[model samples]
Target: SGFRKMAFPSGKVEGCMVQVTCGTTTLNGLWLDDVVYCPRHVICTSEDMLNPNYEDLLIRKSNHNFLVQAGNVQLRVIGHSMQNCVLKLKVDTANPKTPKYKFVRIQPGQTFSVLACYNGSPSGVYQCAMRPNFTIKGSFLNGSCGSVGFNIDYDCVSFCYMHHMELPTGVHAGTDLEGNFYGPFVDRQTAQAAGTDTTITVNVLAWLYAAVINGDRWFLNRFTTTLNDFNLVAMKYNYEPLTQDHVDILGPLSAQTGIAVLDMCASLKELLQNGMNGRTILGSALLEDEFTPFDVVRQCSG
Candidate 1:
């Protein structure tokens, strides 16, 4: 279960495959560094590894960041400017430090003080961050709507919002180290009844797929009992990994199913990367039940 390829039928992604074995791939080698390169991650360098063979399968060698892929299939950021400038800073908000679980966007020409429970972004809810561990970037317009930025202040006592979804006439508002609210949180049955069941957008689905492929469990499982959990609930589906038995029984169909997952992963990543740099959060409905027109008053903690 060390993130090795699903062994049911025993196959791999073919061509330049990195050692996708999660548990074993991340093995610690205390002999290498006092505080070394990668103890549990697949460092993308044959130079450092003493073997250049995995160059094809390696992740980006520069940062050695996190990744995701399908469980058997399936699925970060910044800000700045009063106009289109991305200014980076460490918000003093930290009870702090958590995963970069959720992302955010904001209204134009708005100035916001750093807070986990931010209310500046009308299109988002409470999943911001605290200075404790992770972050949440907010966008400020060019007066002209340009880049994302944070104000030069900090309310460091708290930041890491939280909340629940439910039926409502209200907008999708939420919190941070303070508070937050999403919406129309049906009890599984309610959401499934809609034309679609997922609460997250394709951007998230693809990124999660990256986590699966990368074997980054923290990306997928670290946030047990949090909104990330709820967001994932919106993404549930039915599927079976192609087992040897399945491939034998279903014949050619089993091989085809993988392509379905492969294509979904590729295209999802395409849309995700495409939109990651663009600014058009408003007037968008990535989630099936995410109604427009949030009551911002419900934000900052309601």
Candidate 2:
């Protein structure tokens, strides 16, 4: 967003609404230049942008060399010191020769303004040419803190610093791009888990939700693979007298009586094999051993 609503020439605060959207009710201010998401950011037009009073500091030949016609035609320095001043007015960083402006020296606390009076030159985008001797705070990756200690252009103070989150402990692996530590697909189980159950459940559910809203499935199915096959083991209860058909009538015809069955299976691998390792089930089971069908349960119980 361009500099927030400005009081302008008045040197005071004025009420105005600033938003990402544009319309007749909204006046143009600092905004992105070419990007739709980022576009051009806006800088304020206060004494900061049009340093009309910063005469001695910005003494230089006027490029336009004409009278003032526009509402706020001027130049100002951003960053910690004038020595690091740089401008990017036209979308192009390289200021054209026709404009006739020169690199005006600025101070840490100074600004300069210029008058534009060329006929038919309506208010439009301008570029900030590189200052002869200006710079941003901090080193490249270090951010503004290494340069101006603050950004006069963006009106942020010694910003550019942030914090990172902690990752969970697990069998360490490589290239945790999302920082999930779920990893670079190193070993067997973790890799198979991601490709199989995780992909089928988590990914498919998320994709279906997106499709419901955006009505598009192009991005999805793009990563589909034949990794959905897996052998499932279910435990059956040995209840007698009651015909197996009677137990079957209990609705949960889904086969697996989830509970202790999964734990029993996982426990065997760690115990029976000398060179193998296994994990304990950490979550609740989703299905019952002999679930009555929803219709039967609701009719009989509810």
Candidate 3:
């Protein structure tokens, strides 16, 4: 399945609708009416992506420069307190030569709007870096900082970052390099769970439920085995049913069930005489009998 409306976890307050466009159809934000499901992720885009106002501090700190124009690209800057405050940018972090641009002289509170064309494919992580003398915050998500930096994905020839843009809580929006649309964002944690392998929660619930519903001791024994296999036995305190302590928890079976119990003397005698330690049904049977359905029944029926 490409995308579907997923139920929210209990206790989360539902919010407003977001417009989503996928392929040729557009759907309203209501995630379910037995109607549309959109595949999208909402990303935070507020100018305050960082703590404290880095932009405000920078504007109070620099000077200015020039203007240059070419066939499809224009270049200029406006900050002067720090030497070589203006910067040329690139997508290549290693060589620093490819997709490069460099210049100086853009000042505080001024915009050096540059125009550029992606002659072929418009896609790459674009980054801008300033001189070390100036103080600002910028990085490639991995905390690689120079001076002041900001970035955007270049998917098309043009893009814009307008002010006062607001999105509702509990929803997200994102764009791709193909000039694709921002979409109906889904919950981040839920989305990640879908791609993960090994659902231990589901496995645990099914194992426990099966052992309870069926009176099969084999299932009960294996239930404990599965928990031990996953190292989840610690989740249940004070119980390891396959050991001798099992009888202590449930009391003597004969006293509770009006049945004659086998003696340990006879059990050990058969184990030695038959020499059947490896292929014996007695050992396995004893382990199963330790966790009789009576244990689960008392708790559930009560």
Report the number of the highest-TM-score candidate. Answer: 3
Return whichever of 1 and 2 wins on lDDT. Answer: 1
Instruction: Give one digit per residue, the lDDT tens place, for model 2 in 109-166.
Output: 1111111111212121111111112211111111110011111122211111110111
**Candidate 1 lDDT by residue in tens digits, 1-302:** 11111111101111101111222232111001011111121332323433333333333332213221212221111111110111111112221222122223332112233211111112221222211111222322211111111222122211122221112322212232111112222212122111222222322332233333333322222112222433233334311122233113222221323323333434333433353243222222231111111112122112
The residue-level lDDT of candidate 1 at 186 comes to 23
Better of 2 and 3 by TM-score: 3
lDDT at 262 for candidate 3? 24
Q: In every candidate, how many clashes are there?
A: 59, 38, 16
Write down the TM-score of every candidate: 0.17, 0.14, 0.18
Off by over 4 Å in 3: 1-28, 31-196, 199-202, 222-302
Please give the TM-score that candidate 1 achieves against the real structure: 0.17
Runs in model 1 lying further than 4 Å from the true structure: 1-198, 216-262, 265-302
Candidate 3 per-residue lDDT, tens place, 172-282, comes to: 222221212223322122231111112122212222332334442222221112323322332232122132332232233334432222222123223323444454232
Off by over 4 Å in 2: 1-80, 87-212, 222-302
Tell me the alpha-carbon RMSD of every candidate.
Answer: 25.1, 25.2, 23.8
Q: Higher lDDT: candidate 2 or 3?
A: 3
